[PDB]
Structures are given as C-alpha cells and as structure tokens.
Amino acid sequence: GVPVLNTPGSNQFLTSDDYQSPSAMPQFDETPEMHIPGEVRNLMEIAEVDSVVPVNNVTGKTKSMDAYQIPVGTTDKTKPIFSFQMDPGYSSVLKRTLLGEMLNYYAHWSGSVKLTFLFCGSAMATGKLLISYSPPGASVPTSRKDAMLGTHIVWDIGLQSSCVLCVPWISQSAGYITCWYQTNIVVPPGAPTSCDVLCFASACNDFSVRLLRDTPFMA
Amino acid sequence: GVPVLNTPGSNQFLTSDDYQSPSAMPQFDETPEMHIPGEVRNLMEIAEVDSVVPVNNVTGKTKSMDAYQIPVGTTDKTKPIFSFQMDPGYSSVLKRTLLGEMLNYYAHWSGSVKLTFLFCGSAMATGKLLISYSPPGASVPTSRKDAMLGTHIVWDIGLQSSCVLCVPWISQSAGYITCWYQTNIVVPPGAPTSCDVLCFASACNDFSVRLLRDTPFMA
Amino acid sequence: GVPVLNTPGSNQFLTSDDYQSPSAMPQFDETPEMHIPGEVRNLMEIAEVDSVVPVNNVTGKTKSMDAYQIPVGTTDKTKPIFSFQMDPGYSSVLKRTLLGEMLNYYAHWSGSVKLTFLFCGSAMATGKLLISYSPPGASVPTSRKDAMLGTHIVWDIGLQSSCVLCVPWISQSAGYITCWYQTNIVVPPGAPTSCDVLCFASACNDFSVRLLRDTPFMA
Amino acid sequence: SRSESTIENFMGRAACVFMDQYKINGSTDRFAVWTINIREMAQLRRKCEMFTYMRFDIEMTMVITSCPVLTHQIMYVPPGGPIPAKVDGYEWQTSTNPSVFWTEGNAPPRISIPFISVGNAYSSFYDGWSHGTYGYTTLNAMGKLYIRHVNRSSPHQITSTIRVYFKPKHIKAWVPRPPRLCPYINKRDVNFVVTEITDSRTSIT
C-alpha cells in the first residue's frame, strides 16, 4: 500500500470536529424538501425584529402588562419620565427582548440599537417630550435644561405618534436614554389625561456577533 | 509517508456499511452470467401483480378454498354482501396477499390500491350489484340508499363479468369498500341460483415504500 | 493530515491477499532474466500432451510395463478386449496421467478428452477392431452387435496403425469406451500372433479448469 | 420514490446468521463449523424464498469475543475443500483454503466470497432428486467456515464466542415467488403444517 504516518490527534474525539461520518442507513431515501414559509438562514433576522421593551419594570409590577407601559400625564417636570442603560446584555430593561436574548448567546457583539417610541394616548391629546441620549462617557442629565444641551430630539406627540432613533457604539458604562416633560399633555374635556408610551428595541441593521457562548438564563 | 488522522468511527463495525472488501479468492474465475427469464429488479413488480383476496375469512372457513369465495344469490337486500377496510397493512382481508405481504416489510408506504371483482357465476345469470367506496373520514353506509348517495359503481353482472376500481389515498381509519344487492341474481330454470365473486387486489402503479422494517409474520 | 477511517478488515492477515509488500533488500540488483527453453505460461499446456494410459491395470501387474500393454491376438469374440470409464478424475485408468493428475488439482473442469490408440504389432499383421463409445446415460454394450449399433469406429489395423477419437461431454456416470474383435489378427507364418495396443489420453484443446483444490494423492 | 424497494436494498443487509463458541484448550468443542447456507436465520430465509434463483457475492464479518494476546484463524473451505475433524488436523494448513488471521483488539475481520456455484444461480427451491434425497442439490453449495484459536494453549480457560454477519452483494434474482405462509419446521426441508390463509373475522361485513 501507501506509506502513512499517524499524526498526533488521531483516534481522538474532538467534540467540535466536522468530519464526514458513515451513515447508519444509506439505503434510506429521505423525504423530499418542501417549501415551508419562514426559512431561517441567520439569527440576526430574529434580532432585527422590534419587540416591546419593559421599561416600567418596577418591583411591584413585572408579572403584568404594566411592566411595558410608560405612564405619562399624571407629573412634575423636574424629574424625568424614564431612564435606562442602553446595552442589551446586562441591563434589566433590554435584557429579555428578541434583541437581548439573542445577544446573551454571544460573548462579543458590536452594532447599533434602534429604539422606537410609540405614543398610545388619545388622538385628541397633544404635548412635547424631550428624549435625550447621553454618550457612554458622559454623565446622566439632571435637569431638562442639561438634557436639552446635548443629543436630544423634541418629539411632538400631537403631530406624530412614533419617534425612531438609532443609537451607535453599542458594543462589548454605556449610553443613557432619558425622557423629559418639555410640555405637559394638553387634553380636551372629553379625552382622558393619563396616557401610555411603548418602546421597541431592535437591531439597527448590523450587529455582528462573534463568540457564541451559553445563555445565563437557563440553569 | 503522508500525514493521516484517524477520525472517530475508525475500527468499528457498522453493520450497514458499504465498503469495498478484500476477496477471499481473487484468482477464482466466476461462472459467466446467463439469461434466466424473470429478472427481478424491483419488489413493486411483485406487488403490482393481482392476487385473490380472502374476503370471506369468517371464523369457520379460513383453512379452505371457501375463504376466497364471496357468496351471492342466497339474500335480503337490507344487509350488504361484504365490507372490508381498505388498508393492506393491519387488515385481515388484505393483510396476506402479494400486495399486503410486501407492504409489511416497510414502515411507510403511499400509493393507490386497485381492486378487481370477478363474477364467477353462470353465463345465463344476470343482475346488478352496487359497489360503494367511502372515504377514510366518512362513516360506513348503513343502507343501499346511503351507499348510492356517494362514490359508487352500479355493476351490471349480466353485461360484464369484471369490475375494476382504483382506490386513492391508501397510505400510512381508512376507506371502506362495500357491496349491496341493487338487483337480485335473475336466473333461468337451467342455471343455478347461487354464484360466487372473486376479488383481486394489486398496486395501482405507484406504491412508493420508504422505510424497510422486519415482517410481523415470522417469529 | 487527511481524515481517514479504518474499515473492518484492517490489521488482518488474509492468506490469499495480493497487496504490495516492502522488500527486504531494495538495493539488491537481481540477475537479468535469460532465455531458457520451455517457458510455461499455463498448465493446460501440460495436460494437452499425450501420455500412455495404463488400461491393463489388473491386480497382478501394476508395478511393471505390462500395465500399459493391451493384449490382442490370444481370443474369443464374445468378450470385449478392454473397457474403461472415460472421466479422468476418479477413474483408475485415467487417474494418474499427465491429463488426470492436472485435473485432480481442480474441483470443476469441463472439456473434451482425446484418445489415441497405437497398434504395436508386426507390420505384416492385419485385422479389424471395433471401438465403441457409449454416451454417459447409455448402458455398456454387451455384444459386438450392440456396440456396432451405436457410436463406433471400425479400425483397420493392417491399413493404419493409429486411431484418434475426441470424446465430448467429459466434465464435472460418464461415457464408456470399449473395444471388440470385429476381425481376428490375421498373420503370416513368419510374424508373431500376439500383439499389443497402446493408448494415449490428452486434452482435446479446451479443458477449462475453474476451482483449484488440493490433490488427493499426497498425504 | 421506490428506490429502496430494489433487490439490493431489500436483500443486501447484514444479519447475525451464526452464533457459536469454541474453547481454547481441553475435543470437537474447540472449533466452530457452520456449513454456509441461506436457510439458517428464519427472517433471512423468508426473503431468499421470494425468488427461485439468486446470484450474489458474499461478504462476511465475524465478531469474536473472549472471556496474553489472542489470535484467531477463520478458515473458509471451498465446496470441494478438505474439512478438519480435530483442532490440530492437517487440514488447517491447506494453502487452497483461504483463512484470515485476526488478533484481538483490531477492527473485526472481513472476508468476501464470490459466486462460487457451478451453475448460473443459486437455487432457493429444487424440485428434484440427487440420485436419493429430495430438495437438495450441490449447485447451491457455498462451503464451510472453520474457526479456531491459533494459540497452542493458555493457563486460564478461555471461551471465545463468534458472531457471523452475512451480507449478500451484487444481488441478482429471478422468477418471483409468493412469500411463505406457514412457519418453518426444519432447516433442510420445506415441510410445513397446514395453516390458515389469514386471521379470522366475525362476519363477512
């Protein structure tokens, strides 16, 4: 025959090998593939889908639908409406979403996170809310004036009901996103004063994920 | 020599492998192949051959020739002549035919079953029999009228002596095939009243069989 | 290196294998081949050579030259001169010839056997001998008349001194070859009455031999 | 869609057709014989009895266990070969009889046997006589398989069990035949007890 040397690594079971294996039943004729809608070729197709973010996850109500609802309208302008750290991994607000749960399988991920705020109040209500994003190095704003003197968007609620913003440099002290009463919710005699805001976090079309690991959720 | 790694699966005896083997006597010169009539290249060539179906397999007579003979002519029209579940596997009527015994080697099979009814009475006799096929979901007909209000064929016995029907959706609650006196066997003074009917089950030219298994017949 | 699987049959010594082997002394320069007369490329070249057949192997004389000599001339015409079964294997007359000893190495052999009869009497002697061959199914002839009513050759000894006949269907109850006094040996006053006949069995140019085995001669 | 219904896919698969053991030291219990036939396993016999004439090559894979380094000889005698009557019989040394020498711990030995019949196909059924004996012909004779320890002796008592896996190769079959209804009585003949065609039923409806 041919002269052959067995290198080190012969007769070992590397768990992550990719060798061709002898089939148990070669004779078996497999069922022909059929078209099923929803072919999944990548997991960033899952993380690119928006999902509701439980911003109101206070101690009392994280087992109800009120964890998602941001209460607006009842109401001092000195304290912000909400505030949460931006990173999906290791942040209880974005930890368990379609975006966050995919990113807890990977040690390293770098991309941009797109936030969408939906105003779920009456069509007759109107007002202004100031959404301010602070870069990772910067400190959280203390007043509405200091939030205005930075990266912000004054979102007119009576005009448009959705406000989209794509946050960069989300990768692994991260950025903070906050909201402030610029203007109280102005309402007619017929419409109810208290309103709700929903948030939607998703991938901003990049998200490269490199080192797959085990999820810290299932024991 | 060349560097070689032994993958997992070396020095194992997979029973269903297809490796080239070293011949005991390479020098031996085999007898040249000769033409013998009846070359068998497929087993569905065996299942496509019609064979007599023991419809009359009542408790008394399954060790005689009377198991095959469907008695007709002696005779109320309220009760059907015969009735049997259509599936070849797990049905005592079609369980042991050329068709059924091949299909008990395979876990999965999908195709159509062709039934042929041969009238073995006198040439002078005449009459009509109504053969009704009920789909797998549907219930067995109780009267001749309910069998007529469905998939059926009114088979004139005096005109033609054979009636062929191909049953679809026979694959693995299956279809039921029944027969009813539409018309009594009209006979002259010379010919005998009681007649017999034979059945023939075979493949309707498809029958794909996928997962071979062991027969449940031999212990 | 390359991924390799050891199939079943590795590290075994099949006695009849034909693998290339590592030479003990590759450096050794072999003596160049020289022309020697008598190159033997096939063993049927040995079996195709005629050899004297010990027809007269009676109990007294199988250790002398008289085992080969067929005595003719001294002498009733009712009993045949000689008679022997035709098959080379398992027949004491043709068992140990150049033809028979080659055919005892092979389990299966099919071909034709050529017999040559040489008359070793005086040139002045003359007569006729009737050599009859009976097919394997047929019975041995009892008289010269029944031998004449079959496959035979009336061999005029005074005319020609050699008689050749090729026997077919010798392969593995076989054929019988016999000889009869058609005519007594007519002799002048000077020549001796008693004469001898020699036989020569060889291959009739086919003899295919298929399954080599061990000879039943050497213990 | 019927690719697996072919004869090669149906007939050609290995089955454990012979279980036997043989001691290393102590008469006729020191080797295993097994005259090669298709009528050993009742499950494989029902398949080969669907065709009157079959033509195939044989690939066998022996599986040898034990209870020093043990070496085993699996000697195959052709249908005309000399058979040993004792473990030390000279017939083990015959050059004509091919044998494998397998030592324990390596991949199991595999030996391949061609179509060795005199005729053009093996017969599953023979309606005729040897002269004699009915249903027996020497055309479907495939040889024997003599198996022993090549070791002269051992201080301990060692009993080695061997399993033979018989796989037909390049199968060709002729003249289809109905599958057998009745069970098997004996491994040599075709004798049967009269059995019912099919399981009974309460009525015809």
Closest-CA residue of chain C to D103: C12
Residue type (1 letter), A161:
S
Token pair, residue C25, equals 């002394």
Chains that touch A (3 or more CB pairs under 8 A): B, C, D
Neighbours of D155 (CB within 10 A): 7
The residue to which tokens 């052999």 are assigned = C109
**HEC-encoded secondary structure of chain B:** CEEEEECCCCCCCCCCCCCCCCECCCCCCCCCCCCCCCEECCCHHHHCCCEECCCCCECCCCCCHHHCCEEECCCCCCCCCEEEECCCCCCCCCCCCHHHHHHCCECCEEEEEEEEEEECCCCCCEEEEEEEEECCCCCCCCCHHHHHCCEEEEEECCCCCEEEEEEEEEECCCCEEEEEEEEEEECCCCCCCCEEEEEEEEECCCCEECCECCCCCCC
Q: How far is C89 from chain B (nearest CA, A)?
A: 20
Which two structure tokens, joined as six digits, stand for A64? 């109800």
Can you tell me the distance from the alpha carbon of C44 to that of C202, in angstroms, rounded to the nearest whole number? 10
Asked if residue C202 lies in contact with residue C48, where contact means CB atoms within 8 angstroms, the answer is yes
Q: What chain D residue is nearest to B208 in terms of C-alpha separation?
A: D2
In chain D, what residues touch B37 (CB-CB under 8 Å)?
Answer: 174-175
CB C129 within 8 A of CB C73: no
Give the method used. cryo-EM
- CB neighbour burial string for D56-81, b if at least 16 within 10 angstroms, e if fewer: bbbbbbbbbeeeeebebbbbbbbbbb
Chain C residues closer than 8 Å to D76 by CB: none
Tell if the CB–CB gap between C19 and A1 is shorter than 8 Å: yes
B105 by Cβ neighbours in 10 Å (0-12 / 13-18 / 19+) ranks as buried
**Is C6–B2 a contact, with Cβ atoms under 8 angstroms apart?**
no
Q: What total of structural domains would you count in chain D?
A: 1
B16–A24 C-beta distance less than 8 A: yes
SS3 C47: helix
Q: What is the CATH number of the domain that holds D161?
A: 2.60.120.20
Distance CA B204, CA B111 (A): 7
Write the DSSP assignment of chain D as a string of letters.
--GGGSHHHHH-S-EEEEEEEEES---GGGSB-----SSSSHHHHHHHTTEEEEEEEEEEEEEE------EEEEEEE-TTPPPPSSTT-GGGG-SSS-EEEEETTSSPPEEEE----SSSSEES---SB----BT--STT---EEEEEE-SS--SS--EEEEEEEEEEEEEEEEEE-PPP-SPP--SSS-------SS--BSS--
- What's CA C67's distance to the chain center, in Å? 15
Angstrom distances, CA of residue B68 to CA of A93, B97, B197, B202, C162: 76, 12, 8, 16, 74
Q: Tokens representing A107? A: 């040690």
Q: Can you give the C-alpha Rg of chain B in angstroms? A: 25
Domain that holds residue D196: 1-205
User: Residue C16: its chain B contacts at CB < 8 A?
Assistant: 24-27
Name the B residues in 148-187 with CB < 8 Å from any D CB.
Answer: 178
DSSP state of A182: E
What's at A97, amino acid-wise? T
**C211 vs D106: CB contact, 8 Å cut-off?**
no
Residues C1-219, CATH architecture: Sandwich (2.60)
Closest to B13 (Cβ–Cβ): which among C2, C8, C16? C8
Window 6-45 of D: residues touching A by CB (8 A cutoff) are 9, 13
Q: Which residues of D touch B38 (CB under 8 A)?
A: 52-53, 174-176
Residues of B in contact with C42 (CB under 8 A): none
Q: What is the DSSP letter of C66?
A: G
Give the gap in angstroms from C-alpha D80 to the nearest C-alpha of chain B.
13
For residue D125, the distance in angstroms to the closest alpha carbon of chain A comes to: 28
**Closest to A131 in 3D by CA, of A166, A181, A73:** A181
CB A180 within 8 A of CB A57: no
Whether the Cβ atoms of residue B169 and residue B175 lie closer than 8 Å to each other:
yes
Residue of B nearest to A4 (CA): B1
Q: Do D53 and B23 touch (CB under 8 A)?
A: no
Token pair 């002519």 is found at B73
The three-state DSSP-derived secondary structure of D50-75 is CEEEEEEEEEEEEEECCCCCCEEEEE
The distance of D75 to chain B (nearest Cα, Å) reads: 10
Q: Do C3 and A22 touch (CB under 8 A)?
A: no
Eight-class DSSP state of C164: E
Distance CA B193, CA B125 (A): 8
Distance in Å, alpha carbon of C47 to nearest chain D alpha carbon: 21
* Chains in contact with chain D (at least 3 beta-carbon pairs closer than 8 A): A, B, C
Question: A22, C5: Cβ pair inside 8 Å?
Answer: yes
Q: How many CB pairs under 8 A join B and D?
A: 171
Nearest to D124 by CA among D165, D173, D191: D173
Query: CB under 8 Å, gap of 24 or more: what pairs does D82-88 form?
Result: D82/C214, D83/D144, D83/D146, D84/D31, D84/D146, D86/D27, D86/D28, D87/D30, D87/D31, D87/D148
CA distance C201 to C192: 28
Please name the residue of chain D whose CA is at the shortest distance from the CA of residue A32: D1
- Structure tokens, C195: 């004469």
- Pick A28's closest partner by Cβ from B5, B6, B211: B211
Write out chain C residues lying below 8 Å of A5, CB-based: 1
Q: Measure CB to CB from residue D200 to each of B59, B101, B214 and give the nearest one.
A: B59
Q: Which residues of B touch C212 (CB under 8 A)?
A: 27
